[PDB]
Design an enzyme around this catalytic site. Structure first.
Site, PDB file in Angstrom:
ATOM      1  CD  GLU C 160     -40.456  57.305  32.214  1.00 40.75           C
ATOM      2  OE1 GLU C 160     -40.323  58.546  32.205  1.00 40.75           O
ATOM      3  OE2 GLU C 160     -39.689  56.553  31.582  1.00 40.75           O
ATOM      4  CD  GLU C 348     -40.257  54.615  27.808  1.00 41.28           C
ATOM      5  OE1 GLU C 348     -39.301  55.427  27.806  1.00 41.28           O
ATOM      6  OE2 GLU C 348     -41.451  54.978  27.870  1.00 41.28           O
TER       7      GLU C 348
END
Lengths: 444, 441, 443, 443
Positions: C160, C348
């Site tokens: 991320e 995720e």
């Protein structure tokens, strides 16, 4: 200790308490439509019923009479008086004429706010405050209020918090009509300020009236987190956006050029400021109104357009998350005498919201008592210096519709159950009545 | 038209504009040498290699100055002669200026010395130049050496000439050397120049324990609004902030104007280059204030402009540059400085004009220039009658010289220079100015 | 689901490990960020956390009991390089032990190199804003490849970069909490460059064929109305969140429309050197996606990037995030259409809800529902040929949830942070049964 | 050149006609702009100009003697509608007579509807900034179609909306001389929208097959260096000058990278109504190009649109403009590759040089050279299949050159403005011979 001519008071606004939203010829305001707009107000709450004060005004007059306040401040609902453009509604005006006459009968001075954010929907549909015509629509509204109520009314307040009605409503999108456009916002602010000055001129010129008139601004003093140049620019810009953008035109007859330049990232012409406007905006008044609630500690932000963001505060905080800041209130007043005005100052709103728990027909709000006592002590200390704070109005009389927060927050000294409409006094009301009583009891 | 007995008449030059001898005496290239050789930057690739050849012909030019009768001669020291490499003092280069200043004292002429007149060494530029904060210390090494060797001889010091030009015109607008267009570089450059000014005043007064008058020269152009509209008032304000207040406020008030800081925030997103204690140093007390004046500017509002202003049409009489002849507006400017900024003695360290001078039968009939100077000297006299305390006037320039980006296309001198033969010929203005000085005495 | 489909679960080092000053570990930016006032919920930190540094053996059994094919975890940079250039063999030994044990229990170790725990020594030299952070990260990555590549199943370089970059250096919400768009774009560029160099290093230097890739969080963006203004708003929200990271990774270029929009704060792109974008876009083996929600946006004249959040009438998680499986399907289709044909792993996905412990049990039906809708979407997309090769359920444990602290519970296994007791939530039993059912279908 | 290749020459109405207050003509924005101080070179104006309104018959003979296939001229709007709604038949008669006479002499009339002479009455209502301008222009176009479509060979709706829009309303160089980006984008949009409505009206209402199209000036842009900064600069210069006008005309959309860049001044695009871009992108018969030069650009951090002019070492015209026949070829190839396959006409090409009249002759070998290099480029491109169907030499006569006045001479015929004498320059003789040579080639 307070002087013998010091005015204690309490205050409300029309849309927050009245209710009876489609009764008495009333048509919808911007706030009616805003409450119905998805995601704008807490859990779709509205002022349809509110505190049902339009019907229960007599019971609330007794509560005011019981507090022993010298003055009661309330606002007039524009959409009751002019429910359509050019169409006077005498039923609406009667209610206020009766309300003012009844207060006078009870020895209570009526302090009347003309504009407290309830713009009619017909006005909004022609552009609202963004349109320069809004100056003339507001003047028709004011004229009719002066003509019918100036014999009864003790003081006039033209505008309440043009920062809220202007910037918070047209730039930040938090209040009605909920726009996010800096250009609309500065045009809205200018037309409100201009309508203020045209109204003052109308009262003193056309009506030949010596009734005290003025404006109310909300003022929040701004402090730098550190002494770095960056954080000084942040403070300056926050101060200009919240305070000087309104103080400079009102007392100096000019807009602060530093803020004009800063706003130039969105605003690419100031030709809406016509010649003669700023002289009218700065027309001399009889007093100056201040709504004070808190300070703001700011720091610099390279990624902010206006170069500032909120900094972490370690101060004691209200239920709103606002700093409890009586020392900074004293700074603000001193600054206004040094830089801006020697007019008598009235604290037209001060108060606080705390998480009030009703428990067995009783509300123990020791925290609201603390807040108000600290500020009244700060008012007394300032008057000893010669700062001339002639009066103080405790916000609010009752728990009411608190704008974008709805009924989730409670500012009142009198508790209100909103499903039964029962008024229950809080401990702060008892305390406030006794402060006025103890004051009055020692004076001649 | 009359001047107090202590009033100082003068004339002025700068090193790169007149000296020539660009690679001689140990001198290495400045930013302007490389700018002149960079394409599209200077009129027809003109440069200061030869110029007025003043470095060789200084003695002849002393005679001209001596003959003019000027109380004071203002010249600049070439940084790249004194420190041709970083940390390398060149004593031959210093010797020239010592000789120049010594000879001027012998002929009864007060030497007024400009430390920085835009000729930044290339070694400094290659480390970031004025954008780098070390530039303060590089300049201080230069200034220390000049103070050590010349403070006994020199009559007055000028730290910086026209930081607006060296800063904004050079690092924002890209017209002067090194020709960058970056507002962030520009405000860092200006700040370090102004800070190097203050550090040098501190140095001379503190280290050297000297009472020799020191100050700064700012070029100031008063700004006027085309109309009375709010828009045009904002335009005037922003033009005045950009040209004038950005330099005046730190020098005299120890602060930058926040209205301009906010306007510059469209490009400049942090002011942490302004360290604590900088603005106090920048505003260190001086003995005089120096003003270069040339014209006004009439401005109007522009919605498309980042700084909200453009130039408006002027109907005024104009010089050969197209600049307004504006002696009334000069009076406004001086009155404003007394009212808002400073009560220090003012020296008009440059005033003059370029016109299309024609050499006719051994003579230059520059009555237009005479008129220009006369109108401003009259303004200086009238202002001194009001108590505005303008204690001196230096006529720009002594010689026709290298006029920066315009090259040799524009002639500002009171003495004509044939650049092919290096012959000096007195213009009618030089004879007229010599006679104005005699009359005063 | 297909027979080669991988089911997994995932954690990150700072969120679970604790033992913050033990084993030669020095502070990260998050340790300091937690101890800065006003930045994290009630000043919480990852000092103790799930105590997973000490309790890893217990948690390995829980993971084994779940039946997952793969367990994803991150390596703590400050355990491996507690000072600059100063390798810590103790710190590495832990992760070597962890990965070997998982291999012994029949679990694939998927390893995330960077999950936001920048050492403090790196921050004090400028952090990600500094171009040297590429080299610092390579020294860290080299050591991890040398000691673990034999044991490890897959490598994830970065987790991320939008969060570590824009949320951290532009919006100020994550560590180190700066608010500077110029620092943010440099930070992102150096993260993306360090990814590209690390992929080049694994395949060049070490000569390895271990699957490597990056993980981007992606949030598809929708216009409130069909007006031109709201199309710009959507375009710019999409660019800020997604295209700024997808274009360099897959096209070898930044989106110029965003470069022009960012030029209100960023006035030079000379930090993008020659060769960087070709390195950033080096061919990977898979693409990782962290997915949580969509965002409905509208136009704002007062906003620098021309968009603000619009009111959403969708069902929401405990975070206020839209439950948006349909929009997840839009995103995946868009990526195959515009960007890549690599195998996708949902590295995720999960949710947070107001989880109560009652009578030794956590009745998180809301979390089951959420996960079920997304697993359904994955199965639907794989029928269309969208090639989602695996799914990891964020998260194994209730953990330190960054700026929210321990106020928010994302785990399928409940953690009493006072006792460090692990209690299986209903979602963990359910997920173990989903995996079991999938395995029973296989011949 | 091919058998159907059209050689031409071109003028515009205000540049040559004069008779500014005669024949019922009322002022345009350019009359007022010329009377405004500081806007035009030494207060020069088009009061007399080349006096072509009175001397049109002489100038027809010059065109006839040139041997051109086509003559391109513009219609003065204020001659046709000197007030709003009031048609003036005396003004229309002039253009009818002009077109008829050209047909009798074997010359094809190519007619430009808008060449920058907006009536003052239209300006006083907001001009091109006002959406009503679309309708005002349609009333003007209708009348011209009704009276002239039988006589006219081809229609050009608009000439250089970059000039009439951006140079006029943003940069302040042309009339009305405003400096407002918000006004500029509205002006351009309405001009482009009026184009599309006019094309629809000709093919729909009038049911006419007369070829119609737009003329855009196009200047290809080049980066000084290969750096990222300089690529952005080139990108942005190309968008400002070219793509902003090409994209709506051929793709039915505005380039979002430029919308984002213009958002520093333009804070809403609601002036772009639903349906507008489909009307703007309505199919045309040909595409018109005014070409003059390239622009070499570099990056500028202090510039709002991130670019400034870079030093060029090319040979230059008397304007300082680069002589750029190679870059012209790049432009044409790019248009075929990215935008359109319509037949292209070079509706303006030419140059200004310091012409000296010497012994009744003008020795403009410099202009000959310029035109020769571009005609060579046209021929080379047509061997590649680029389909440039014609070339119009700007200009027939030395004329009023806008903000430069009579200081710059673009004509192939010399005009002594003190006497109104036409004198053929060497280029005019040369050009006539080139056409002759081409005719002699055809069977």
């Amino acid at each position: 200790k307070f002087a013998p001519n010091f005015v204690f008071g309490t205050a409300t606004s029309s849309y927050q308490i009245e209710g009876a939203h489609d009764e008495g010829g009333r048509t919808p305001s911007i706030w009616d439509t805003f409450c119905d707009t998805d995601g704008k107000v807490f859990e779709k709450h509205n002022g349809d019923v509110a505190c049902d004060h339009y019907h229960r005004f007599e019971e609330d007059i007794q509560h005011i009479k019981q507090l022993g306040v010298d003055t009661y401040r309330f606002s007039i609902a524009w959409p009751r008086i002019f429910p359509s453009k050019g169409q006077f509604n005498p039923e609406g005006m009667a209610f206020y004429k009766t309300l003012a006459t009844r207060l006078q009968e009870e020895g209570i001075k009526p302090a009347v706010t003309l504009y407290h954010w309830d713009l009619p929907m017909w006005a909004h549909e022609e552009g609202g405050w963004v349109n320069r015509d809004s100056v003339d629509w507001f003047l028709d509204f004011a004229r009719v209020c002066f003509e019918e109520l100036d014999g009864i009314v003790d003081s006039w307040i033209t505008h309440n918090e043009p920062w809220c009605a202007g910037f918070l409503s047209y730039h930040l999108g938090q209040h009605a009509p909920g726009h996010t456009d800096m250009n609309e916002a500065v045009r809205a602010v200018h037309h409100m300020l201009l309508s203020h000055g045209k109204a003052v001129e109308m009262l003193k010129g056309e009506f030949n009236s010596a009734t005290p008139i003025g404006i109310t601004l909300n003022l929040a003093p701004k402090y730098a987190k550190t002494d770095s140049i960056n954080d000084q620019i942040a403070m300056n810009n926050a101060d200009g956006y919240a305070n000087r953008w309104f103080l400079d035109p009102i007392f100096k007859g000019q807009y602060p050029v530093d803020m004009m330049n800063l706003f130039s990232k969105y605003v690419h012409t100031y030709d809406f400021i016509h010649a003669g406007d700023l002289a009218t905006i700065s027309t001399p008044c009889d007093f100056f109104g201040i709504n004070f609630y808190s300070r703001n500690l700011v720091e610099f932000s390279a990624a902010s357009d206006f170069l500032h963001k909120d900094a972490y505060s370690d101060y004691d905080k209200t239920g709103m998350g606002w700093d409890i800041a009586p020392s900074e209130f004293k700074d603000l007043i001193r600054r206004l005498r040094a830089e801006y005005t020697d007019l008598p100052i009235y604290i037209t709103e001060n108060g606080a919201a705390f998480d009030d728990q009703l428990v067995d027909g009783k509300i123990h709000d020791q925290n609201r008592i603390d807040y108000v006592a600290q500020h009244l002590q700060a008012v007394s200390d300032l008057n000893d210096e010669g700062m001339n704070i002639a009066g103080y109005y405790l916000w609010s009389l009752l728990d009411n519709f608190e704008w974008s927060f709805g009924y989730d927050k409670r500012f009142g000294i009198i508790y209100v159950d909103f499903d039964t409409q029962e008024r229950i006094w809080k401990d702060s009301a008892h305390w406030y009545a006794n402060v006025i009583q103890t004051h009055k009891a020692a004076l001649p």
